[PDB]
Design a protein around this ligand. Structure first.
Ligand SMILES: [Zn+2]
Ligand SMILES: [Zn+2]
Lengths: 306, 306
């Protein structure tokens, strides 16, 4: 029936994208009701150096210095303010395409969709995960700052990510919509060293359950294991240790499939110690960890109206 | 900077999705101006057998038997007709969200975005390719028929695919928006055998150029080859033979990168004969063939308004 890396429908977010220009600098903003949210470094001058005190850079920036447009049409800025690492530009008009929304701060290992945008206009949409070291591995060119990541629960955009910078490795760092960076990262072009790339165990298992639900059966074996035994293997291959909380989340998929969570762990243990035999799983030649148990259930599925 | 499997913004297509019900059966339709397009087998009874003559099944179906809704609101059907394997339902109201659009018939090896839909409402969006054997490897559950695939040139949805059936392998077959199936497939639940899964050579090369543009350099070697020599290797590993036409398309990427097309072919030759050394490329542990040269250029990129 088919399991694909699946993004959320993005039309609701397309309707909120604007471009924001300050001085010379140009990035994207998110227009929700009468507020536009964007990265505060729209105010700088784009280098290493020269003044970093966003506070004092900001003392020099009046409402009329923030130029906010998308589609053709100008928005009038009546107030501004800095909230951690984001700016909130109050505009005189409420976005008529404002969707029901929430801001949340996502947890590591959660997935979300990113609408990549270049100075105000949609480019594309893709799915990714918040990595255990709080980077994300995205697709962001010079211009994409202020692009956002989000989920939709069946009736709602929850916004979870705003893009702010690329690191050395070429991985990506950003904030929630309250302006707080994920991880230790800061909006300043200094070294940071990313952090241990580590694999999201509960997501790999969920994806293995997806493979079975589609007939890519071969990695079923006749073994079982225990949480403590599996976690030894996990802390050799730099996987998240598995807990009973992970086991509980996977409960519906084990019962959806009749395959006990610890039996699936033994399949995974075997795949880790022995690799994939030149074989593949759901057209993947390595283990996949950016589908949550939530993402898998949703994709052999339920919702409807007929 | 980052290269991801990237779908098109889908809000323009979200605005055209409706559900269509006939009898008992329920699938999706595409509402553009005053026409709704949907698979003709919305009229059957959903099995192997019983009457297949879509013509005569259709003689029994009046305008008022076609129930067309999305969001809450009913559309009035004033005419219907069969165009190859699609139905065209004329409705009394033009879709006010009609985007500038075209229908085209895509070529094998071209990619497009699919908006997976379940009886009228958006579920998710993903990117895929039309395979050389004219299947696509998608994610389509019971209900997804009438979901569409499309591209956007910078100002336009060109619709290229409508989903109609799953085959034995669990791969997918469908039509263009004129109702003609891609490949030899027919809207009847009989065996068909898919056809040789064969790899889209020019797309793999384009993706290798993407890897270089991002620093996943290791598969550069000090070899070259010729088209005829490379194509021998291609017809051992079931790759499309490479032609000068493919070489010409890749021209901009070779000059974007300074790496001659035939030198990149020699890198690919080496990867085919020797595998990937347990190494990966753009976080892929196998060669990737559903990015076109068009898709790669667009993703270290150009477009703008600042
Ligand atoms: Zn930014
Ligand atoms: Zn159908």
């Amino acid at each position: 029936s088919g399991f694909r890396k699946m993004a959320f429908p993005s039309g609701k977010v397309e309707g909120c994208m604007v471009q924001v220009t300050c001085g010379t600098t140009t990035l994207n903003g998110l227009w929700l009701d009468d507020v536009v949210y964007c990265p505060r470094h729209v105010i700088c001058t784009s280098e290493d150096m020269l003044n970093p005190n966003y506070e004092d850079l900001l003392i020099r920036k009046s409402n009329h210095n923030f130029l906010v447009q998308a589609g053709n049409v100008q928005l009038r800025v009546i107030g501004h303010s800095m909230q951690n690492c984001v700016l909130k530009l109050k505009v005189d008009t409420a976005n008529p395409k404002t969707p029901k929304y929430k801001f949340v701060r996502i947890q590591p290992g959660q997935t979300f969709s990113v609408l990549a945008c270049y100075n105000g206009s949609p480019s594309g949409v893709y799915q990714c995960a918040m990595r255990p070291n709080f980077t994300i591995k995205g697709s962001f060119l010079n211009g994409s700052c202020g692009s956002v990541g989000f989920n939709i629960d069946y009736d709602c955009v929850s916004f979870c990510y705003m893009h702010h910078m690329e690191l050395p490795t070429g991985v990506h760092a950003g904030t929630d919509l309250e302006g707080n960076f994920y991880g230790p990262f800061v909006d300043r072009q200094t070294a940071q060293a990313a952090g241990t790339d580590t694999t999201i165990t509960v997501n790999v298992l969920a994806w293995l359950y997806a493979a079975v639900i589609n007939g890519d059966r071969w990695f079923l074996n006749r073994f079982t294991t225990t949480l403590n035994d599996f976690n030894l293997v996990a802390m050799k291959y730099n996987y998240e240790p598995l807990t009973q909380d992970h086991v509980d989340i996977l409960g519906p998929l084990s019962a959806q499939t009749g395959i006990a969570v610890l039996d699936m762990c033994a399949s995974l243990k075997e795949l880790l110690q022995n690799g994939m035999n030149g074989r593949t799983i759901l057209g993947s030649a390595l283990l996949e960890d950016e589908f949550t148990p939530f993402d898998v259930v949703r994709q052999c599925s339920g919702v409807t109206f007929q």
